[PDB]
């Protein structure tokens, strides 16, 4: 009788994995996006005798760090990181989140931002002059030129902070900013150090990394597994219903 529960649990976890894949497909154009992996884990139950039940629970190990392509928009202050670059921004609660979304905006008071989160460079949240044109170097230096002034008045005003993360030690957060895991945080310190080995380029913006072929194959496999589990449910129910007639007299 309990064989129905493992099958229904498998069907429910397949539905959850389908939801994850659909969420991955939905944001196929958000700049600086990391796809969500998914996998099924077997969870056997150890009873007394004849261990014949092994459930399944869907799980997501984490984002895969394969960089996507980058569109050349020629915008002066659009940056794209290297293979494992990470722009460090300040989240809502003061934690330092890591992103690859290079679309940097400027507020009225010269404050830099990314989707409302102030990007922090060498020091604190960097603020450029009021209405000056901004240029990003090949390694994170920020140059400002006040409009109307002669071109020989361009001056450095700050420097970005770029950290290098391997990818297997970073976990996503609820808001969507990757942070170090507990062990990696303990090993490398609470806050990372701005390594000088990372180089970036301006004028390009990196897209998302979602594989349509992987998405399609996952969807097909999920649908087929769901159908098989439903057939198992039907068979078990029919067998139990016909077996209960034995209880009569």
């Amino acid at each position: 009788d309990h064989a129905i529960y493992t099958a229904m649990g498998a069907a429910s976890q397949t539905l959850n994995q389908q939801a994850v894949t659909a969420s991955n497909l939905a944001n196929a154009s958000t700049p600086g996006f990391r796809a969500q992996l998914n996998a099924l884990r077997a969870v056997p139950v150890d009873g007394l005798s004849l261990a014949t039940r092994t459930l399944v629970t869907a799980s997501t190990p984490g984002a895969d760090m394969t960089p996507g392509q980058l569109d050349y928009t020629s915008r002066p202050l659009d940056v794209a990181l290297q293979q494992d670059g990470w722009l460090v921004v300040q989240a809502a609660d003061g934690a330092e989140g890591y992103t690859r979304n290079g679309n940097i905006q400027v507020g009225p008071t010269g404050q830099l931002t990314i989707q409302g989160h102030p990007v922090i460079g060498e020091g604190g949240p960097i603020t450029v002059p009021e209405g000056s044109e901004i240029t990003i170097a090949a390694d994170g230096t920020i140059s400002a030129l006040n409009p109307g002034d002669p071109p020989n008045t361009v001056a450095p005003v700050g420097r970005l902070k770029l950290v290098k993360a391997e990818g297997n030690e970073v976990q996503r957060s609820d808001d969507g900013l990757f942070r170090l895991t507990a062990e990696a945080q303990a090993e490398r310190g609470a806050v990372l150090a701005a390594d000088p080995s990372i180089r970036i380029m301006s004028g390009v913006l990196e897209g998302s990394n979602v594989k349509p072929v992987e998405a399609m194959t996952d969807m097909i496999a999920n649908a087929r597994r769901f159908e098989m589990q439903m057939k198992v449910i039907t068979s078990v129910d029919e067998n139990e219903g016909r077996a209960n007639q034995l209880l009569s007299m």
């Binding site: 884990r41 969870v43 056997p44 139950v45 150890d46 009873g47 007394l48 005798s49 004849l50 459930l55 629970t57």
Partner: peptide, 21 residues
């Protein structure tokens, strides 16, 4: 012993650990 037989003390609790510590 054999399943379906009778025994003096109850079965131990059953657990399904997601990941072994």
């Amino acid at each position: 012993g054999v399943p379906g037989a009778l025994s003096n003390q109850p079965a131990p609790p059953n657990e399904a650990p997601i990941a072994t510590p």
